[PDB]
Design a binder for this molecule. Structure first.
Ligand SMILES: *[C@@H]1O[C@H](CO)[C@@H](O[C@@H]2O[C@H](CO)[C@@H](O)[C@H](O)[C@H]2NC(C)=O)[C@H](O)[C@H]1NC(C)=O
Ligand SMILES: *[C@@H]1O[C@H](CO)[C@@H](O)[C@H](O)[C@H]1NC(C)=O
Ligand SMILES: *[C@@H]1O[C@H](CO)[C@@H](O)[C@H](O)[C@H]1NC(C)=O
Ligand SMILES: *[C@@H]1O[C@H](CO)[C@@H](O)[C@H](O)[C@H]1NC(C)=O
Ligand SMILES: [Ca+2]
Ligand SMILES: [Ca+2]
Ligand SMILES: [Ca+2]
Ligand SMILES: [Ca+2]
Ligand SMILES: [Ca+2]
Ligand SMILES: [Zn+2]
Lengths: 685, 35
């Protein structure tokens, strides 16, 4: 009961009985890109349109055709092609597909350079009866130059089954011609789509980009270009079909309004929607309202709704409007789609490549070697308004740890600066510090450390850092961020390499190796499966008089300190004086303390400026796992030691391991040559 | 001077990646002269 109603391939002239009128039409080739079509050329005087005969349409009737308007990237609201119908023999005309959520049956210039297939299901929207159709642009006096347009391959008749899932053309309502990659007699089966999308616009991710150029106007991110929807006509951006079955997120930057004050009420919202059927039907993901607080560029991260999860979902940003005219524009930047629901436990990298699925964002960062690294590192060296790197989401549990090689400027500058290190459990909508600034003020802690661990003097050159991940980082989707807080000079460079965040190497290679694919690669002088057997004898003793230069056979790190006489005799001769403006930190080589009894040294405060308060007291801590964890031995109280005193401490049994190291560090001071301290005649024996 | 470095007419050495970046890193803008 469902006859084919109209079919025209125009492929050597049209079929006369299909059409009542085609003023302005010719047969030929327009825009040989996406053979014979019905072209409506600019120059042609009078009405530009084409009208079908009267047709008995029913519940099952669709209109399907190919079209190209303008063959350009020039979005305009002028001389669009309207698909319309008439129940009164052309007396009056109406949009076949009104505007609502979905755009009207109006086809604007610039939407896509190439040809596109379109389909409207008449019978779902409108009642059966005797009906007339047309594709109308307008009526043009001689001289007018409206955009050129064309239709091809027009079918009016019964819909195919399931509408071919949106991924095919319908022949006569019985057979589907599936788009490349789609198969099955209904176009249902989908070839493996990508499960990831990233667009910075600094450059196939999109099917259409209508109504928007890449611009620097109205910017959020001062690295570069954004997508600016300032034009007229249709404002819409549409992704390729994506596998989102296991995706976690859609995130992007977005600004609503680009004006002096508050965007006006009549501004239509921006709609984020999804489609599992090639564009045929759209479900709302998020409405974005223009409001008194919208005229500001901001970060939007959303979780993937359950209903969007399929091996073939596409997304769109669309701003509705009656006549392709708008009150306030909008901007969009840094679009990422992806993640994993399995939210895996291991993110690992040596940066031979820079995979964006692991490193969502890296503004200011370059894949390059620096500072004698192994191959490339991720490097923040170039001129930047911003420097940071955000990881993708991984699942963090009891056995999870962060391990990275870090380097600051590598003797380029002598600036004192710190790289913030943060974590997020809400997809980067808010960041918290990984290591929270804690000191012997309360049992509120038993480990002691500073918020700012990654400091420029300590980390001048490559230094490994291993952190067991705190309980508050445990979630299914924790991402990490390295952040250089502005303002900052260019020459405050930094870099990361050999990143392992995960749970694959239990015990953390004992502090003497790095985890690489669930296996430990040990530091030199160490072997074994977990790096706990040393290759040679570690020294059983540490003695230092500081009458000569601190040696690399005694100390791994000396920050903020130099040999001086400024304190007078602390023990005798020169002492190691700490009065620097950045870190003040002293760290011993690993020592075999199997048979060791004590640690001792002479000690004085304020050779220059007397310490001001408690938190400025030097702490003495020990580690039996390569500095991964530190155990307080002594708070060297601030108000004590105004003249040189002697400190003698018995080693606790747990400190007497085959590889123990010590550190003295000041958590706080008023800066250069303030709250200073000195140590002489260190003895561990 | 180092390989991943560029020698200024200062005798000064800078990272070669600072050559041609609209900042004067040599202090005699010889890192910017030929771009
Ligand atoms: C957004 O700003 C508008 C403009 O100021 C606010 O609307 C005004 O509210 C004041 C006081 O309530 C009235 O006197 C004005 O007549 C309103 N102006 C107009 C023309 O809208 C509005 O309250 C703000 N929105 C929110 C949510 O605070
Ligand atoms: C579709 O149906 C019409 C009936 O008018 C016919 O002319 C045409 O050959 C059919 N097409 C195919 C490919 O079967
Ligand atoms: C999701 O997990 C698989 C590993 O099973 C991985 O290959 C893929 O890249 C992940 N996708 C994203 C976007 O993280
Ligand atoms: C630790 O010291 C003891 C004796 O002092 C020695 O037997 C052992 O081999 C030492 N370990 C290493 C590897 O230095
Ligand atoms: Ca044709
Ligand atoms: Ca951008
Ligand atoms: Ca590397
Ligand atoms: Ca001395
Ligand atoms: Ca330069
Ligand atoms: Zn920060």
């Amino acid at each position: 009961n469902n006859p084919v109603l109209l079919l025209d391939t125009f492929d050597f002239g049209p079929r006369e009985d299909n059409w009542f009128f085609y003023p302005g039409g010719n047969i030929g080739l327009y825009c040989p890109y996406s053979d014979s079509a019905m072209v409506f050329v600019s120059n042609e005087v009078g009405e530009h349109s084409i009208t079908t005969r009267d047709l008995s349409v029913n519940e099952n009737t669709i209109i399907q055709f190919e079209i190209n308007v303008g063959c350009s990237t020039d979005s305009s609201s002028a001389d669009p092609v309207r698909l319309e119908f008439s129940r009164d023999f052309g007396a009056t005309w109406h949009l076949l597909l009104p505007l609502c959520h979905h755009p009207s049956s109006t086809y604007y210039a610039g939407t896509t350079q190439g040809w596109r297939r379109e389909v409207v299901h008449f019978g779902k929207l409108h009642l059966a009866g005797s009906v007339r159709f047309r594709w109308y642009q307008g009526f043009y006096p001689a001289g007018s130059q409206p955009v050129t347009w064309a239709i091809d391959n027009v079918y009016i008749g019964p819909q195919c089954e399931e509408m071919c899932y949106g991924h095919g053309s319908c022949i006569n309502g019985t057979k589907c011609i599936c788009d490349p990659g789609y198969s099955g007699p209904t176009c249902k089966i989908s070839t493996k789509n990508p499960d990831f999308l990233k667009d910075d616009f600094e450059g196939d991710r999109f099917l259409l980009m209508s109504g928007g150029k890449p611009s620097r106007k109205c910017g959020i991110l001062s690295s570069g270009n954004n997508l600016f929807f300032n034009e007229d006509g249709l404002r819409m951006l549409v992704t390729r079909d994506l596998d989102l079955s296991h995706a976690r997120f859609v995130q992007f930057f977005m600004r609503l309004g680009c004006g002096k004050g508050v965007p006006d009420p009549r501004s239509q919202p921006v709609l984020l929607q999804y489609s599992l059927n090639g564009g045929l039907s759209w479900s709302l993901l998020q409405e974005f309202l223009f409001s008194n607080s919208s005229n500001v560029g901001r970060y939007i991260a959303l979780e993937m709704p359950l209903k969007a999860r399929s091996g073939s979902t596409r997304l769109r940003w669309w701003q509705p409007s009656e006549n392709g005219h708008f009150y306030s524009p909008w901007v969009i930047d840094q679009i990422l789609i992806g993640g994993n629901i399995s939210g895996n436990t291991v993110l690992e990298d040596d940066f031979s490549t820079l995979d964006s699925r692991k490193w969502l964002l890296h503004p200011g960062g370059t894949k390059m070697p620096v500072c004698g690294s192994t191959g490339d590192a991720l490097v923040f060296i170039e001129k930047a308004s911003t420097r940071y790197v955000v990881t993708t989401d991984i699942a963090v549990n009891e056995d999870s740890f962060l391990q990275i090689d870090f380097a600051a400027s590598c003797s380029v500058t002598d600036s004192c600066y710190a790289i913030e290190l943060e974590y997020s459990v809400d997809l980067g909508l808010s960041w918290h510090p990984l290591v929270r600034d804690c000191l012997p003020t309360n049992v509120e802690c038993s480990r002691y450390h500073l918020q700012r661990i990654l400091v420029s003097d300590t980390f001048n050159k490559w230094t490994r850092i291993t952190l067991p991940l705190p309980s508050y980082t445990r979630s299914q989707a924790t991402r990490f961020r390295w952040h250089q807080p502005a303002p900052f000079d260019k020459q405050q460079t930094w870099a990361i390499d050999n990143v392992y965040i995960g749970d694959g190497c239990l015990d953390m290679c004992s502090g003497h190796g790095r985890c690489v694919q669930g296996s430990c690669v040990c530091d030199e002088q160490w072997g074994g499966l977990y790096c706990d057997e040393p290759e040679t004898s570690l020294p059983t003793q540490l003695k230092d008089n500081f009458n000569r230069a601190p040696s690399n056979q005694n100390w791994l790190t000396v920050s903020g300190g130099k040999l001086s006489t400024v304190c007078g005799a602390v023990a005798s001769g020169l002492a190691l004086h700490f009065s620097g403006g950045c870190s003040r930190l002293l760290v011993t080589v690993d020592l075999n303390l199997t048979n060791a009894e004590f640690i001792q040294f002479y000690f004085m405060y304020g050779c220059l400026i007397t310490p001001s308060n408690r938190n400025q007291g030097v702490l003495l801590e020990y580690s039996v796992n390569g500095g991964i964890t530190w155990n307080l031995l002594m708070e060297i109280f601030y108000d004590q030691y105004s003249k040189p005193g002697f400190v003698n401490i018995l080693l606790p049994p747990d400190a007497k391991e085959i590889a123990t190291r010590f550190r003295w560090w000041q958590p706080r001071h008023d800066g250069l040559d303030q709250n200073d301290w000195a140590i002489d005649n260190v003895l561990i024996s | 001077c180092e390989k991943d470095q560029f020698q200024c007419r200062n005798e000064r050495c800078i990272p070669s990646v600072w050559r041609c970046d609209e900042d004067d890193d040599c202090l005699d803008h010889s890192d910017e002269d030929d771009c």
